[PDB]
Design an enzyme around this catalytic site. Structure first.
Site, mmCIF file in Angstrom:
data_model
loop_
_atom_site.group_PDB
_atom_site.id
_atom_site.type_symbol
_atom_site.label_atom_id
_atom_site.label_comp_id
_atom_site.label_asym_id
_atom_site.label_seq_id
_atom_site.Cartn_x
_atom_site.Cartn_y
_atom_site.Cartn_z
ATOM 1 N N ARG A 1 -4.554 -1.050 -4.883
ATOM 2 C CA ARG A 1 -4.210 -2.498 -4.918
ATOM 3 C C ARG A 1 -4.336 -3.116 -3.526
ATOM 4 N NH1 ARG A 1 1.361 -4.887 -7.320
ATOM 5 N NH2 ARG A 1 0.289 -4.148 -9.199
ATOM 6 N N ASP B 1 7.009 -0.098 -6.163
ATOM 7 C CA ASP B 1 6.586 -0.995 -5.053
ATOM 8 C C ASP B 1 5.658 -2.092 -5.593
ATOM 9 O OD1 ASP B 1 6.547 -1.916 -2.390
ATOM 10 O OD2 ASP B 1 4.646 -0.873 -2.031
ATOM 11 N N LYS C 1 -9.107 2.803 -0.645
ATOM 12 C CA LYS C 1 -8.436 2.807 0.680
ATOM 13 C C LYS C 1 -8.811 4.105 1.404
ATOM 14 C CE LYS C 1 -4.666 0.132 -1.487
ATOM 15 N NZ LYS C 1 -3.229 -0.218 -1.352
ATOM 16 N N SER D 1 4.077 -0.040 2.409
ATOM 17 C CA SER D 1 5.206 -0.644 1.668
ATOM 18 C C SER D 1 5.779 0.400 0.687
ATOM 19 C CB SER D 1 4.769 -1.941 1.004
ATOM 20 O OG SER D 1 3.655 -1.731 0.147
ATOM 21 N N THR E 1 0.867 -1.223 0.000
ATOM 22 C CA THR E 1 0.000 0.000 0.000
ATOM 23 C C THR E 1 0.890 1.255 0.000
ATOM 24 O OG1 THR E 1 -1.953 -1.049 0.932
ATOM 25 C CG2 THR E 1 -1.657 1.265 1.449
ATOM 26 N N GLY F 1 -1.411 -1.908 6.729
ATOM 27 C CA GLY F 1 -1.421 -2.928 7.792
ATOM 28 C C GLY F 1 -2.674 -3.775 7.665
ATOM 29 N N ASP G 1 -2.982 4.341 -3.363
ATOM 30 C CA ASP G 1 -3.092 3.462 -4.552
ATOM 31 C C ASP G 1 -4.382 2.662 -4.363
ATOM 32 O OD1 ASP G 1 -1.548 1.870 -2.474
ATOM 33 O OD2 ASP G 1 -1.851 0.322 -4.026
ATOM 34 N N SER H 1 2.083 -2.218 -4.023
ATOM 35 C CA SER H 1 1.216 -1.088 -4.450
ATOM 36 C C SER H 1 1.103 -1.084 -5.972
ATOM 37 C CB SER H 1 1.771 0.216 -3.952
ATOM 38 O OG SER H 1 2.206 0.088 -2.604
HETATM 39 MG MG MG Z 1 2.464 -7.307 -11.318
#
Ligand code: MG
Ligand code: A1IFL
Ligand code: A1IFL
Ligand code: A1IFL
Ligand code: MG
Ligand code: MG
Ligand code: MG
Ligand code: MG
Lengths: 204, 222, 222, 224, 195, 211, 196, 195, 198
Positions: free
Chosen positions: B19, B166, B33, B129, B1, B47, B17, B169
């Site tokens: 994901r 990342d 989010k 992350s 994230t 988390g 993001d 993310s």
């Molecule tokens: Mg991928």
């Protein structure tokens, strides 16, 4: 050790044009030993369908718990619970056991009786809501189902088509998992009527 | 994230993001989010996803009740004190990490809370992350007296550093802008730079392809 | 304590045609949540019309491919320029891997080529040298995502002739090189969507009687 | 099996139109104590290669001695040691990659991350990474330690893919590198203000820049 | 890195501005000098969570003290920190310096290390970076310095602690407690590094 | 799941075809029988590499015995090379359960169970692997010495199918072998996929499944 | 472990339970009844940890008996199994769970049908044509997957047990000292005294 | 607590005199300055066994060097220590400062910490007591001090490290390496404590 | 563990040894002979770790058979026992010890007397009127302590075992699938083929 890996089992839900579909395998095992070829993981409360994967004692307990809660709901509200609402009940019911959770991966499917919109959702064991439009996967072959659904799934499938797609996603993912298979059942849900089909699949 | 807060001259913006991951697997290709504690106080977490969602709704419900009780707009230091004291009680067993941004009668605010019940304050924050990638963009392009258009640009470019560099993310960028004058505006899918390419083939099966043992109509009514 | 292994991610996929074979991988190399390279090739032309990928811990991958290429060079020296048949390659790799049975190469390795009858061939190996010839195989991070799709769309598993009451299985009528590449590209667009360790680039090496051709395609970069 | 004691932090690097740039601060940490402030972690080999080393500093000084010996050894019976048969970046890298991988395989690693940056005799830019596991990769930007997390994101905005390398000048790339070093000083607790930088350009050759400092820091916003 | 020093005028409190999660800096510009009363302040070192949670409770207790019995002594503020830290020693990782000024006793400095013990001291160092400045601080502190001497003694002291300790860095903030009241002071790298 | 039993008509050898990596199904199309020579079969259960490599190495050592002594190797002496090999690696973590099944004029039809613990046993009936118990169940309650080749083939097939069904770590297909005076004959590959439904109908068994 | 089998035929449920009670190195008893009558047409067999096993069986027995006297009515087998599963399902998340696995064989006088319920100590309930607890299952399931028919008489069902008990005497490492066998049918519960 | 400092007339080496086994002082008047040649000394910190075994081997290596190739450079002495400490790093717990005087390069100071790395420095501090005097030594060291200033700098520095570190104590021994030869200095508690 | 019994009577030694071989949850064989003939008047029974058991037995056998041809002469039971004890006592301090316990029953043709040696995997040797290995001894020693007499005939000896095996079939948890019984006397070694109901 891992409660989610003792019994095995899988559930997947997909949405289509004016329809949803939910499927599960029938295996109930104790590690290597298959025990029952007739353990259904999909249940319903009115027109809201719930599949559950995980520790089979929690699959059984949670079903008995949601039947209880949905019966009291219907007596007070004087109407059947709707998928969006049931999803919030399942979510909060799990987070209530946060530091002692039910070892399950639930999946909700249904059609909002008012709006007619197809709806599906999924949860982790402490009740995080994963709301996707396309498909929801759970169980000991969740990796395989993710790959089968991602590849096979296209939006706005007519119920007849959606039935082939979900059936093929389940069968092929189950055949690559030791702890899943031993037969499957698939529910095809429309506003008015619901068809339930048992699939012929490899019995190993 | 990847989530970021950025203060500008007349308010504060947050961004995240889209994901959601179960270990190495992308569960939701586009999940929001960005949550509201109250109309003009927004939230973004990382988390344990059940913990962040659960803790947001609890403090959100208590803030509503408190608002009605005092006939006053919710303040951000209230959502901050309540999250803080709750997370501290549970000794970090509640895996909630939040950036909270918002405007209220006292001005505009940007804070962060960690699972143990530590709080941070700053002109620019990040978490998840994607924390380090976003912070590197922020440390490089942030200046004092940002406009609205500049703070959206900076917060949006911080989330991209996450999306690209990342693995935790990706997908699109959600942004909420809270300006001191106006209503908070939520821009779901502000950027969609990760569209899936048309597949090489249709996988629609010819009808009857699947082997069926038994069929029956199910009774939904009485 | 020092841990002599890592996981550098990525995914590979071998499929056998009637008179051809493909080995394909992503070009992304990762550590934990960081990207090391977006283009670090992983499939190799080893000569005598054999292609090889040793996906997993890239260091054990590079050591193995290196030692096989050297096995091929010394086979030429010691046996008067004789061509190393794919079956003979496979068995040689078994010995390469099994020589490190009590401190193994952390790789899942595939090879592709033509057998001595000119038919397409794919051999796949566990990390200590168990091996078998096959029609298709995916290895690496996303193997669990793709292999089910390959069973379904390459070997036609769980599919039957419409309106035969699930009694006549779909006949194994075999795939053209254009059709195989389509399945490979979809297999990778899918894996890239659902696995955080897969993306950036797809490299496909195709082996016919006329030699080894390469194709390259972009993949999403989140 | 060992544990690193005196250690050095991020090495960062990128390639540009005509060469490669590499940089590394001048710090030797001893756990949390910032003990040694005079440490060069860029090792020039001939005039077409710089090796940047992060991790255990004693293992760094061993690799320093190995590279000086490699220059000596290559001169032996080589009337072309300063021409066609000079050492290459690709040659120096493949030796270190061999040695790193042997040492991990004997369960006695050199506790390091190494970037080898250079220009080959044919003008091609060389940039490649190897560490204590013997893991190797190339990319138009490479970094070790904290720099993988913070520097790579920033340098990747300048060079995202291979097609961007002919579009990037020494000015643009050097500026990106000095900016990344500032960010690492802000956010890496084991970093220093004092750093060295090296450019290997296929025309101007090897420029080695000592005693650089992070300047133009923003701290003023603090007071409120 | 945190310290307080007792001088002629009153008392000075200094800190670095670094919050870290291992070797990652989470915040380089954080204020670690929080007011307990109008002319009582604490300096926090240890867990962020643990120090904030305790600072808030001390603050609540001194706000209630003030409502009922008026202006609390510095000794009283130290006493409440001690009480919390001692009685909850098994769950707390916090090292706290309390510095305050009233008109009878003038400047006072209390220190509360991991034990939950209390120590009244002419000056006090604490936090990871303090280990490096014990020799320098012992050698350079004398009784009855001026405000400017005391600001310089702290400036140089924390400068050293920041240079050597990797767990310390950013700006030096100080708070000066006198009859006049509260004066906030900040010192940036480009000033204190070239000492 | 592998078995070998001795009867009036020689030896029956039957094996599943499944390779696992824990709960991941790696293959359904694996050979678990090594044809060592026209009169010697070896069965493979346990570590995939350990079985394949050392039963291939047994194949070499047996060939070397024919060149040296100008005589086909005895089942006793073949089982004992593998047995003695395995015993040198004891404690190191090899994992193999194997039946050496063959005909020599001197010994008659002979079966040796050999396992990575060092255990070497002659016998008429063995079942080896995670599925062994499921197979014993069917085999032990239908076995006579006096079965026809046709009935003994079926019992062997039906005993692997049994374990393919219950044991999560067995299946794919049944490979069948018959070992006589004239050597081994291969009685084909039977996909459990189609075998189960043909048997359940024809036999009227497997009443626990809905079909 | 101890041996706990059951098999449902046309008109009855048959429960076979091992007679051995072993502590470390000594068989203490060779004539042990691992069964309690819950009500005149419902029988529960059990095996697991030492004290837990009887303490749980008797506690269930008491409760079902109490319900019988209160409602002057016999709960269906379906109802009794549901009661038992819930007790175990509570037990697993308590301070010291009951470590007991059970088979419930009952004759439902309302539906005129035999019913066999297998329930483990986690509260994992399933209705089966045949069931087993512990190592027994590994041999008996595939055996009965071969030799079981649904229309079998009580006599054909005893034969089918002899076949299970011989396989276990042959291939299982524990001397379990044979089994006590009980039939649950429309006339209630009786014991086959002559299985020896 | 051990240190060496590079001044105008050459180099100076100082150390405490404490050998401890846990919290028990085994010897309070040990000599941790050991000669390796006429004008090359080592200061030992760490394991008494490990340091004493190493010092004896280096001494042998330089006695053999001298027999063959005449006087070794201080750099050479340091390289022998480095080689031993680097190659035996899995089994050694030694921290060594090497200080030498020749007529070419005058005073040099080398330090070999736990890993086996070598660092040439104007001054080096090491041992448990060193942590407490980083701030002091860094604020007070100048290049091109006199013999009298450098003894003063080292006397004061070690004084503070003994005060603060319970693993250091006793007398301060020093060795002065210059053209003139080797001078041995001792300072007792009664002199250095009252600084 | 498996069952390893021995009992010395007037003019013979009788070894009785369980026929069960059990890996995990399956009895693999029910007719195992846990004994090797070392010489025409010396027999060794053995139980212990899966592999080591026979490997040790067959190794000792080969060595005794070698000694016999070289000297054209049979070693005393005392000599064979002392050789075997020493082999184990080396094995105990080697990289991977033989985990094997043995009884050696022999008839000494020089002394005209039967001899029974019990030796554990450490190299602990003792001469006994009756002996046992594993859990079996917990029952049989107190049984034989009661019913044993040194002047018993071979026929009495066999009734004394039938009494030991019944007691073990009653009270031990393992199915050991009965015993194979061998007599060592002046005339060599013969197997009592009817112990299944004697
Ligand atoms: Mg991928
Ligand atoms: C001078 O000596 C400074 N040295 C720096 C530092 C960081 O050690 C610190 O003590 C600083 C103190 C301030 C006080 C005012 C509030 C902010 C913090 N501490 C931290 O930055 C603290 C480090 C720390 C964590 C944990 C423990 O013991 C459990 C001791 C020290 N940082 C944090 O707590 C961050 C907060 C993020 O917002 N988070 C974590 O460390 C994460 N968890 C900590 C618990 O373990 C699990 C992970 O300043 C002194 C004065
Ligand atoms: C009947 O009882 C069958 N049950 C199925 C099965 C799979 O368990 C197995 O024992 C089978 C034996 C056959 C497989 C096909 C080749 C001939 C041998 N074993 C496996 O498939 C084996 C499982 C296994 C893994 C590990 C260990 O301990 C080390 C024991 C058994 N699979 C593998 O070995 C996989 C192969 C495909 O990935 N690879 C690995 O496990 C790789 N690791 C092995 C251990 O060392 C580290 C690497 O068949 C019986 C007869
Ligand atoms: C300044 O920084 C001083 N710090 C004090 C001190 C005492 O620790 C020490 O390092 C001193 C160094 C000199 C070296 C020349 C020989 C005399 C001592 N160290 C010791 O005295 C040493 C402490 C120590 C022991 C072990 C280890 O790591 C294993 C590190 C330090 N003392 C000993 O070794 C005593 C000597 C008794 O004759 N022995 C033991 O403690 C026995 N232990 C051996 C290791 O295993 C545990 C038992 O001086 C510096 C300069
Ligand atoms: Mg399956
Ligand atoms: Mg610092
Ligand atoms: Mg199976
Ligand atoms: Mg159960």
């Amino acid at each position: 050790s891992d409660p989610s890996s003792i019994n095995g089992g899988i559930v997947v839900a997909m949405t289509g044009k004016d329809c949803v579909a939910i499927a599960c395998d029938l295996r109930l095992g104790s590690q290597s030993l298959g025990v029952s070829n007739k353990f259904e993981k999909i249940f319903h409360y009115g027109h809201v369908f719930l599949g559950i994967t995980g520790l089979a004692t929690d699959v059984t307990t949670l079903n008995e718990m949601f039947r209880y809660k949905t019966n009291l709901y219907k007596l007070k509200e004087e109407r059947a619970i709707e998928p969006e609402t049931f999803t919030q009940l399942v979510s909060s019911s799990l987070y209530e056991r946060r530091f002692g959770p039910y070892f399950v991966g639930p999946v909700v499917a249904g059609i909002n009786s008012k709006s007619g919109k197809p709806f599906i959702a999924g949860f982790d064991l402490i009740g995080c809501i994963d709301e996707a439009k396309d498909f929801i996967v759970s169980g000991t072959a969740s990796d395989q189902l993710f790959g089968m659904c991602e590849s096979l799934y296209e939006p706005n499938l007519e119920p007849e088509d959606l039935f082939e797609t979900i059936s093929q996603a389940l069968l092929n993912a189950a055949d690559r998992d030791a702890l899943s298979g031993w037969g499957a059942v698939v529910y095809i849900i429309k506003k008015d009527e619901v068809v339930k089909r048992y699939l012929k699949m490899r019995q190993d | 994230t990847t989530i970021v807060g950025v203060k500008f001259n007349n308010g504060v913006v947050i961004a995240a993001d889209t994901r959601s991951t179960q270990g190495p697997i992308v569960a939701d290709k586009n999940c929001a989010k960005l949550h509201r504690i109250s109309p003009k106080i927004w939230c973004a977490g990382a988390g344990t996803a059940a913990d962040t969602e659960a803790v947001t709704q609890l403090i959100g419900s208590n803030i509503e009740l408190h608002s009605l009780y005092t006939s006053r707009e919710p303040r951000v230091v209230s959502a901050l004190q309540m999250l803080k004291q709750h997370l501290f009680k549970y000794q970090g067993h509640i895996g909630a990490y939040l950036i909270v941004a918002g405007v209220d009668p006292t001005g505009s605010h940007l804070f962060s809370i960690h699972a143990h019940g530590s709080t941070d304050v700053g002109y620019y924050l990040s978490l998840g992350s994607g924390s380090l990638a976003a912070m590197a963009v922020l440390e490089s392009h942030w200046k004092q007296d940002l406009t609205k258009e500049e703070a959206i640009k900076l917060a949006s470019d911080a989330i991209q550093a996450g999306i690209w560099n990342d693995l935790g993310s990706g997908s699109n960028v959600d942004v909420c802008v809270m300006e001191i004058g106006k209503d908070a505006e939520y821009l779901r899918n502000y950027l969609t730079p990760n569209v899936r390419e048309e597949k090489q083939k249709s996988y629609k099966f010819p009808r009857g392809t699947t082997a069926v043992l038994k069929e029956s109509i199910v009774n939904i009514c009485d | 304590q020092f841990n002599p292994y890592g996981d550098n991610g990525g995914t590979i996929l071998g499929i056998a045609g009637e008179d051809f074979a493909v080995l394909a991988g992503d070009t992304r190399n990762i550590t934990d949540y960081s990207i090391n390279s977006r283009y670090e090739p992983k499939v190799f032309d080893c000569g005598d019309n054999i292609v090889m990928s040793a996906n997993g811990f890239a260091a054990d991958g590079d050591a193995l491919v290196k030692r096989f290429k050297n096995s091929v060079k010394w086979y030429h020296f010691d046996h008067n320029d004789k061509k190393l048949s794919i079956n003979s390659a496979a068995r040689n790799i078994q010995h390469l891997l099994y020589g490190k049975r009590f401190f193994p190469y952390y790789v899942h390795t595939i090879i592709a080529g033509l057998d001595e009858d000119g038919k397409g061939a794919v051999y796949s190996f566990d990390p200590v040298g168990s091996y078998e010839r096959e029609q298709c195989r995916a290895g690496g991070a996303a193997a669990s995502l793709i292999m089910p799709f390959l069973d379904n769309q390459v070997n036609f598993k769980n599919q039957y002739e419409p309106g035969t009451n699930g009694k006549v299985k779909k006949p194994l009528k075999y795939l053209s090189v254009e059709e195989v590449i389509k399945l490979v590209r979809d297999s990778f667009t899918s894996a890239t969507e659902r696995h955080i360790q897969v993306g950036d680039g797809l490299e496909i090496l195709i082996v016919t009687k006329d030699g080894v051709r390469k194709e390259f395609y972009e993949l999403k970069r989140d | 099996t060992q544990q690193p004691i005196v250690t050095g932090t991020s090495v960062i690097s990128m390639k540009y139109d005509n060469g490669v740039i590499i940089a590394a601060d001048n710090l030797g940490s001893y756990g949390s104590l910032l003990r040694f402030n005079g440490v060069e972690r860029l090792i020039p080999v001939g005039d077409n290669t710089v090796v940047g080393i992060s991790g255990d500093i004693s293992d760094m000084q061993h690799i320093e001695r190995l590279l000086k010996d490699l220059v000596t050894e290559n001169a032996y019976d080589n009337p072309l040691a300063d021409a066609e048969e000079a050492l290459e970046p690709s040659y120096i890298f493949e030796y270190l990659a061999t040695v790193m991988y042997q040492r991990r395989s004997k369960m006695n690693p050199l506790w390091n991350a190494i970037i080898v940056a250079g220009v080959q005799s044919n003008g091609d830019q060389f940039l490649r990474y190897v560490n204590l596991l013997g893991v190797t990769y190339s990319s138009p930007t490479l970094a070790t330690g904290f720099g993988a997390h913070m520097a790579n994101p920033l340098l990747r905005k300048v060079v995202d893919r291979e097609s961007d390398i002919p579009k990037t000048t020494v000015q643009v790339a050097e500026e990106a590198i000095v900016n990344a070093m500032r960010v690492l000083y802000y956010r890496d607790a084991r970093s220093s203000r004092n750093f060295s930088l090296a450019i290997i350009d296929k025309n101007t050759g090897l420029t080695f820049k000592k005693n650089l400092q992070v300047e133009n820091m923003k701290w003023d916003f603090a007071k409120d | 890195t945190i310290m307080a020093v007792e001088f002629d005028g009153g008392v000075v409190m200094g800190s670095d501005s670094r919050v870290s999660a291992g070797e990652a800096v989470v915040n380089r510009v954080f204020d670690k000098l929080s007011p307990l009363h109008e002319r009582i302040y604490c300096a926090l070192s240890g867990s962020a969570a643990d120090t904030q949670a305790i600072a808030d409770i001390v603050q609540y207790h001194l706000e209630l003290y003030t409502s009922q019995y008026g202006t609390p002594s510095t000794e009283t503020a130290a006493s409440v920190f001690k009480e919390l830290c001692y009685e909850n020693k098994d769950n707390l990782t916090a090292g706290i310096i309390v510095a305050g000024y009233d008109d009878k006793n003038k400047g006072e400095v209390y220190t509360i290390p991991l034990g939950g013990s209390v120590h009244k001291l002419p000056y006090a160092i604490a936090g990871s970076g303090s280990t490096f400045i014990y020799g320098y601080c012992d050698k350079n502190f004398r009784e009855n310095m001026s405000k400017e001497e005391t600001v310089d003694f702290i400036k140089h002291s924390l400068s050293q602690a920041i240079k050597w300790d990797g767990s310390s860095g950013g700006v030096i903030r100080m708070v000066v407690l006198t009859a006049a009241g509260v004066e906030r002071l900040i010192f940036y790298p480009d000033e204190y590094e070239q000492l | 799941t592998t078995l070998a039993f001795r009867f009036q008509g020689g030896i029956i050898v039957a094996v599943d075809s499944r390779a696992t990596a824990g709960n991941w199904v790696a293959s359904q199309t694996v050979k678990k029988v090594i044809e060592i020579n026209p009169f010697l079969l070896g069965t493979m259960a346990g570590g995939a590499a350990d079985c394949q490599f050392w039963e291939t190495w047994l194949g070499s050592q047996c060939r070397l015995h024919e060149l040296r002594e100008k005589e086909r190797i005895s089942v006793a002496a073949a089982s004992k090379i593998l047995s003695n090999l395995v015993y040198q690696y004891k404690g190191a973590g090899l994992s193999m359960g194997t039946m050496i099944c063959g005909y020599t004029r001197k010994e008659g039809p002979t079966i040796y169970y050999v396992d990575s613990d060092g255990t070497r046993l002659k016998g008429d009936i063995f079942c080896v692997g995670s599925g062994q118990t499921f197979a014993y169940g069917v085999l032990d309650s239908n076995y006579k010495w006096d079965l026809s080749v046709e009935d003994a083939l079926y019992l062997g097939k039906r005993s692997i199918l049994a374990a393919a069904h219950r044991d999560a770590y067995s299946g794919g297909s049944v490979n069948l072998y018959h070992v006589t005076e004239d050597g081994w004959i291969y009685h084909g590959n039977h996909d459990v996929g189609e075998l189960f439904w043909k048997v359940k109908e024809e036999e009227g068994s497997f009443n626990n499944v809905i079909g | 472990m101890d041996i706990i089998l059951g098999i449902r035929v046309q008109d009855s449920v048959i429960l076979a339970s091992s007679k051995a009670v072993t502590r470390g190195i000594s068989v203490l008893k060779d004539s042990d009844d691992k069964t309690r009558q819950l009500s005149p047409h419902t029988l529960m067999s059990f095996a697991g940890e030492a004290g837990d096993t009887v303490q749980f069986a008797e506690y269930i027995q008491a409760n079902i008996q109490l319900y019988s006297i209160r409602e002057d009515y016999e709960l269906s087998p379906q109802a009794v199994s549901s009661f038992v599963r819930q007790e175990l399902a509570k037990s697993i998340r308590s301070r010291r769970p009951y470590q007991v696995n059970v088979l419930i064989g009952g004759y439902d006088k309302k539906k005129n049908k035999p019913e066999l319920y297998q329930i483990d100590y986690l509260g994992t309930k399933v209705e089966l044509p045949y069931g087993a607890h512990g190592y027994s299952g590994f041999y008996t399931f595939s055996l009965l997957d071969h030799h079981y028919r649904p229309d079998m008489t009580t006599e054909e069902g005893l034969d089918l047990l002899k076949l299970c008990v011989q396989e276990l005497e042959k291939r299982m490492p524990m001397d379990f000292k044979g089994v006590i066998v009980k039939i649950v049918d429309k006339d209630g519960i009786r014991q086959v005294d002559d299985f020896q």
